[PDB]
């Protein structure tokens, strides 16, 4: 049994003794270590991210997660410090048994039923609308960071280790996101990008779930843009200017592949329409996450008599808060169905 003095993720700084056991290393990398463990008083499994923390400043990931409380974001239960002589921050997270990456991989070996594509994407856009309302850009949207509870079909966004509150005028690094999900303005080297890069990445996830494989499987930075161009066609000079004005060059003119021919023969037209409004070259032309939630692709989720394939009721889908609606409050006319009032 390991006992630490841990501070709850929510509320004021009120540290308390927390004991946990059965710690196993699940992942490793440059970020640090991710452990699985069990809380003794409750028996619940948790996940622990261990990163080295300097004592002279606050951990950016920690400060972001402490302001988040949302059904579709992984909860920070506790954080505590531990250890030659270095001090590590440990983030104690809720444990969700599955990720989107693993579930999609099974179908990549057939296609995920579209009811689940609606369910998972809807919750992802909800989580994006929530964090974007704080000015926070996740910057690592990809299937591996989408936790799933298969029993309840609840999705939870995690890994805020790349996240940042984007502030106008402060440039940011362009080499962000996993390659398959990187927005084209990032590939062009734009440093003044906005939270709309998350919407691009979310568009790639949606297309991947419809297609059964990543839509833009680039093998490198430039090749990633080539894969994008081979689907969307060559971006126009105006679209390039919106992404990065420093490209006055002339690129070969590749024709856009017909969107309805990109996906499977019976892909719902609403799904293809949503993809095209997310995977827009011009960053400001993409839907916001809240607009995405209100898209007609998710109308079936607002049906009072909607049936899930697991035989259970749908999770919380319409418990929007003022903070979540702040980018466009009148969208609640669509987002909250009459039976949810």
């Amino acid at each position: 049994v390991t006992t630490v003095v841990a501070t709850p993720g929510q509320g004021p700084d009120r540290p308390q003794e927390v004991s946990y056991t059965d710690t196993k290393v699940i992942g490793n990398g440059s970020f640090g270590v991710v452990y699985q463990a069990k809380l003794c008083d409750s028996g619940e499994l948790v996940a622990i991210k261990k990163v080295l923390q300097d004592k002279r400043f606050k951990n950016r990931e920690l400060q972001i997660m402490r302001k988040l409380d949302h059904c579709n974001i992984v909860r920070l239960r506790y954080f505590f410090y531990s250890s030659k002589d270095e001090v590590y921050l440990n983030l104690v997270l809720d444990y969700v048994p599955e990720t989107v990456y693993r579930v999609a991989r099974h179908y990549s070996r057939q296609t995920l039923p579209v009811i689940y594509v609606k369910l998972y994407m809807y919750q992802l856009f909800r989580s994006l609308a929530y964090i974007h309302s704080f000015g926070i850009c996740h910057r690592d949207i990809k299937p591996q960071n989408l936790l799933l509870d298969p029993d309840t079909a609840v999705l939870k966004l995690c890994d805020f280790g790349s996240a940042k509150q984007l502030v106008r005028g402060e440039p940011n690094v362009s080499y962000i996101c996993s390659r398959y999900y990187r927005a084209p303005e990032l590939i062009f080297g734009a440093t003044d990008y906005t939270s709309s890069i998350d919407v691009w990445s979310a568009g790639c996830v949606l297309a991947e779930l419809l297609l059964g494989q990543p839509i833009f499987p680039g093998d490198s930075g430039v090749d990633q843009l080539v894969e994008i161009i081979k689907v969307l066609g060559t971006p126009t000079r105006e679209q390039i200017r919106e992404m990065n004005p420093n490209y006055e060059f002339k690129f070969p003119q590749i024709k856009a592949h017909p969107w309805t021919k990109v996906f499977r023969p019976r892909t719902p037209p609403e799904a293809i329409a949503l993809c095209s409004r997310l995977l827009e070259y011009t960053p400001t032309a993409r839907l916001t996450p809240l607009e995405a939630c209100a898209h007609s692709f998710f109308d079936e989720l607002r049906d009072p008599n909607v049936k899930l394939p697991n035989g259970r009721d749908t999770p919380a889908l319409f418990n929007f808060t003022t903070q979540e609606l702040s980018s466009n409050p009148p969208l609640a006319t669509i987002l909250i169905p009459p039976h949810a009032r």
């Binding site: 062009f188 080297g189 430039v222 080539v226 161009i229 490209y247 060059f249 690129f251 070969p252 590749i254």
Partner: peptide, 16 residues
């Protein structure tokens, strides 16, 4: 900025 565009133009013609 000039180096990226050159490689991009090159790779686009192989698919064009």
């Amino acid at each position: 900025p000039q180096k990226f565009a050159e490689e991009l133009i090159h790779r686009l013609e192989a698919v064009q």
